[PDB]
Symmetry: C2
Subunit: 222 residues, 2 copies
C-alpha cells in the first residue's frame, strides 16, 4: 500500500533553545503497523548542545503507531498529501518549548521538517545543566477537535540524583487530505515508550527507538 | 488488615463555585482491592446547582485502587492514620477549581471531608450552562515527590454537540503516617473510568461509579 510494512524516514530539524541555535538531521526506519521505529540522529550545527538532548526527543513520527481495535488511523490515511503537527511543551520550572513539524512523502520515503523554539529554561536547571536521564513511558490522550486531532499529556523527565521534572504537552495535529476522504477517530489513547539504543560524544549522536500502540481504555464499563 | 475486601464510605462536602455556595453528602461502598466503588450523592444546600455537576466528580476516593504488579499501595498502607489530598484543576477556558480533602477511618467506615473553591468559570461556557456529558476515561501519572506523592493528568469533559473541554489536574497526596513506616512506590499510572450511573432532580441526586487500576507501561 502507500504506507508499506517497512518505511524509511529522513528528518531535518532546526531551532533555538534559549539563545543557542542548532541543527540536527536524522535517518531511520520502522514498521508503521507494528508501531516501532528507530532514528539515528546527528547534531550537525551548534554541537555539542549545551542543553539536555532529552527536550528534543519527542520532536523526532506519528505514522508509526500501531492502531489496534477499531481505531481509524488519522495519520496513515493522510497520505499521499501527509500532515502537520504543532506542540507547546511547558516545563514546571520554566522552560517552554514550541515544536512544529511537516510530514510528507517522496519516493516511498517519509520526510520530516521540524522547527524548535525553546525559551526561559533556567540557567542552572537540569535541562541547561544536562542533568537528565530520559523520559518515563506514557500515554497521550487523543480526541477530535476542529477539522483536526488534538493530543494532551504530562511527561516525566528523569533527573540525575533521582526525582523528575514534569512538563505538559499540548499538541494539535492536522491532515492535508480534504477531510471528506478522512475517517476521523473518536477519543483514544496512545501508549508510548521512548528509549535509546546508543548515544555518543555528549549526545551529538543519538540513536532513538519508539514503541507506540493506540488503544481504547481496556477497563470494563457500567 | 484494617482495610477489608468490602468497605463503606460517608462523605461531607462544602464549597462555592462562581459564588454559588453549596453542600453535598454521600454514602457508598466498594471493593478496595478490586478498585471499584459506588457513591450515592445528595446536594443538601444550594440545590439545584447552577453549574455542571461534572466539575465536582473527581472530588468524591483513593483507597479503592486495584494495585497490580509490584506497586506499593500508598493509600491502603496509610491507615489507621489516613491521608490528605489537595488539587488544582485548571480548565482551558479559565475556570480553576481548588479542592482540599481529608480521608479518615472511623469505626470501620471510610470518612471523607472535602472543601471546594471554583472561580472564573465563563458565565456562558459549558460548565455554567450545563452542557456537559461526563468524563472520558484517563490515566493519572503517579510519582514520588516532595516527601509524598504527586499526580498529574489531563481530563476531557464531553460536551453536547460532540466536542470536549480539557482541564489539567495537579495533585499532592500527603500521608498522615510517619514516612519511615511507608514503602514508597516508583513511577506508575492509574487507569480510571468514572461513570455516572444515575441523576435525579436536576443533578440534585447523583449516583457515580469508579473503576481504578494501578499499573506500569506494558508494551
Ligand atoms: Cl505527545
Amino acid at each position: 500500500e502507500l504506507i508499506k510494512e517497512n518505511m524509511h524516514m529522513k528528518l531535518y530539524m532546526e531551532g533555538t533553545v534559549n539563545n543557542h541555535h542548532f541543527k540536527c538531521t536524522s535517518e531511520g526506519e520502522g514498521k508503521p503497523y507494528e508501531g516501532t521505529q528507530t532514528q539515528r540522529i546527528k547534531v550537525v550545527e551548534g554541537g555539542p548542545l549545551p542543553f539536555a538532548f532529552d527536550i528534543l526527543a519527542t520532536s523526532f513520527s506519528k505514522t508509526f503507531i500501531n492502531h489496534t481495535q477499531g481505531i481509524p488511523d488519522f495519520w496513515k490515511q493522510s497520505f499521499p498529501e501527509g500532515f502537520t503537527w504543532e506542540r507547546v511543551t511547558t516545563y514546571e520550572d520554566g522552560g517552554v518549548l514550541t515544536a512544529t513539524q511537516d510530514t510528507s512523502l517522496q519516493d516511498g520515503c517519509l520526510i520530516y521538517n521540524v522547527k524548535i523554539r525553546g525559551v526561559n529554561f533556567p540557567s542552572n536547571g537540569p535541562v541547561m545543566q544536562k542533568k537528565t536521564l530520559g523520559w518515563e513511558a506514557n500515554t497521550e490522550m487523543m480526541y477530535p477537535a476542529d477539522g483536526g486531532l488534538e493530543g494532551r499529556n504530562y511527561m516525566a523527565l528523569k533527573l540525575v540524583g533521582g526525582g523528575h521534572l514534569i512538563c505538559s504537552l499540548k499538541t494539535t495535529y492536522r491532515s492535508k487530505k480534504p477531510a471528506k476522504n478522512l475517517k476521523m477517530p473518536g477519543v483514544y489513547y496512545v501508549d508510548r515508550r521512548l528509549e535509546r539504543i546508543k548515544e555518543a560524544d555528549k549526545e551529538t549522536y543519538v540513536e532513538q527507538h519508539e514503541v507506540a500502540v493506540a488503544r481504547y481504555c481496556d477497563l470494563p464499563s457500567k
